Design a protein around this ligand. Structure first.
Ligand SMILES: NC(=[NH2+])NCCC[C@H](N)C(=O)O
Ligand SMILES: O=C(O)CCC(=O)C(=O)O
Ligand SMILES: O=C(O)CCC(=O)C(=O)O
Ligand SMILES: [Fe+3]
Lengths: 340, 338
């Protein structure tokens, strides 16, 4: 049966907005995704993305009302929609690399992730990430167990705002779990300003920090080298004091040269977020949208077998304002940031 | 070729949009009631599919001038006389058109208003007012409404301006112009991309166009932007598809920047000449892409007898979250309450 509710974390009373699909809602969503897979080339082909926001209107009405409430909740951490259909037998094995993960059997889950995403905003990708795919793949890769990227397993994916260095960073990160037999978590933390010295909060609102791109990441790429070598002075907190946005990377953020007070405030924040991390586990057919304006996220160490049974998610970036990134996109309809 | 995207409603589509608007009017008090606006994005999904498809094509077209939806139902007899002032224009009979404007608008983004414009109403009224004939505000008639980016002065200016024509007996034209960078040349484009201009709030944000009971402090932000405008650009974004931000009556080059003053002078002559007409008849709704075009209104003679031209108007943002510093709370839609 259909249900939805608010799951608090610390003082964040709407931290998690949880929706449980009824069996009929799960079937309705699956039928729409399967129809899209019959009519359109790819989950991120131009033909589909031109239509995706209107096709998303055919998702179950009760679900659409709850997603719309989440979209306008400026204190949201994670929207979680549980109980989508995943046919494990038909899906087949977890591929051994994202380069082999855009499979025919998994297309219907990419389509469904884009349909849910398109209720929140417009889907985008990154030229430097998984060949500029909008629907990307999160799965463990043999030989990258001890890497700083989403294909890690043995070593914690360090928490960060997604693409923290970039003015074009996503408003939401979406994750559609295809399988997760060992219940491996995404880590999540937001700032509780009532747990931090107001003077530290004041410092974090100042343009007193450098956020550099991961090595992961032409006038755009001229800006990417300038971002490593001559990083702009940016704030970590921005907006209304009652609902500040957060932008920080635990591995790639420093205070401006000689700003010892900023260095102090940054390390106070890093210790606070480190201590406030909680977990969201997505079972097969569970989809999460993290509000990238409000939370950092990462992933816990886990034990990959590399036998075709490993954890596998589809991943997407969503922007509230596609138009604002036009300088960094190839043409009006292109969704790949840094393509031109 | 597709700068103006038009859909003419079939009789069934017109009836379906009217029925949805009347269902909203039965449920909610005001067309900008908080409970309605919370629900508006999902209620808008019940508009006719053919219309939602064309609105979505318009939304993703970064060279759009205006989406025009023709032939909505307007009952002229039931509507009654055109009010003599926007303050009196929140009429029972006109509620249904307010609701329908917000439903169309909510396909493109989230609706916002201004603390300092028509007393912070989200659904506003464009109608001629006796004594404002020669003014620079939307209630003018005799003096052409100068072309402008809506709320050009503000970083929170709308992405779309929605205009729902309730009546327009003399077919008075809305004016529209975009910028062709090729026609002004790379030299002037380079200058307009520079932060070398002052854009002041227009007169409708002044206490002279709001109720006298409105707090003085609502207006401190506007008066600061009139007195001490920031140095800003007129063009931004991709060179191949630049956004436009200029008000023909409230924009100047920064003192001493003769190059900038020349570029502005060139832009004004280019836009003033290319300025073209769109007539919104009763039941016609337009959404101007406020990132791409300036707009205005041709001069006309008002009769002031209750038969005059009357539009409902709305501001639409692609990104409500970005203005949270200027809004009272998460759901509040009135810019300048913080
Ligand atoms: N150049 C101008 N007249 N600018 C102001 C335009 C009218 C303004 N949008 C109003 O609501 O009154
Ligand atoms: O693997 C996860 O749970 C999270 C991965 C992710 O969101 C990311 O790649 O940034
Ligand atoms: O009256 C019109 O058609 C345009 C109105 C307008 O430009 C405005 O209200 O700012
Ligand atoms: Fe205007």
């Amino acid at each position: 049966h259909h249900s939805s509710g608010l799951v608090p974390r610390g003082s964040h009373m709407t931290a998690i907005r949880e929706i449980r699909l009824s069996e009929p809602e799960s079937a309705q969503a699956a039928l729409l995704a399967l129809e899209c897979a019959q009519r359109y080339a790819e989950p991120d082909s131009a033909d589909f993305l031109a239509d995706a926001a209107v096709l998303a209107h055919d998702l179950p009405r009760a679900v659409r009302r709850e997603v719309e409430r989440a979209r306008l909740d400026d204190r949201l951490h994670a929207l979680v929609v549980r109980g989508n259909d995943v046919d494990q037998d038909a899906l087949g094995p977890t591929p051994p690399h994202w380069r082999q993960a855009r499979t025919a059997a998994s297309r219907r889950y990419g389509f469904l992730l884009v349909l849910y995403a398109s209720l929140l905003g417009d889907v985008v990708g990154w030229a430097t990430q998984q060949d500029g795919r909008v629907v990307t793949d999160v799965l463990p890769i043999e030989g990258q167990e001890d890497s700083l990227v989403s294909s890690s397993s043995s070593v914690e994916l360090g928490w960060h705002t997604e693409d923290a260095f970039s003015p074009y960073r996503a408003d939401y990160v979406g994750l559609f779990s295809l399988r997760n037999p060992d219940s491996v978590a995404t880590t999540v933390a937001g700032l509780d300003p009532d747990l931090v010295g107001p003077a530290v909060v004041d410092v974090l609102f100042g343009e007193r920090f450098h956020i550099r791109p991961d090595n992961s990441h032409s006038d755009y790429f001229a800006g990417i080298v300038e971002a490593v070598e001559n990083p702009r002075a940016v704030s970590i907190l921005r907006g209304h004091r009652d609902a500040p946005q957060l932008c920080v990377d635990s591995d790639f953020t420093t205070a401006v040269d000689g700003d010892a007070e900023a260095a102090g405030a940054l390390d106070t924040l890093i210790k606070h977020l480190g201590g406030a991390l909680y977990e969201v586990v997505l079972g097969p057919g569970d989809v999460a949208f993290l509000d990238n304006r409000n939370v950092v996220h990462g992933r816990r160490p886990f034990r990959a077998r590399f036998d075709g049974t490993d954890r596998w998610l589809k991943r997407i970036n969503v922007t509230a304002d596609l138009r604002k990134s036009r300088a960094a996109r190839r043409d009006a309809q292109a969704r790949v940031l840094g393509e031109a």
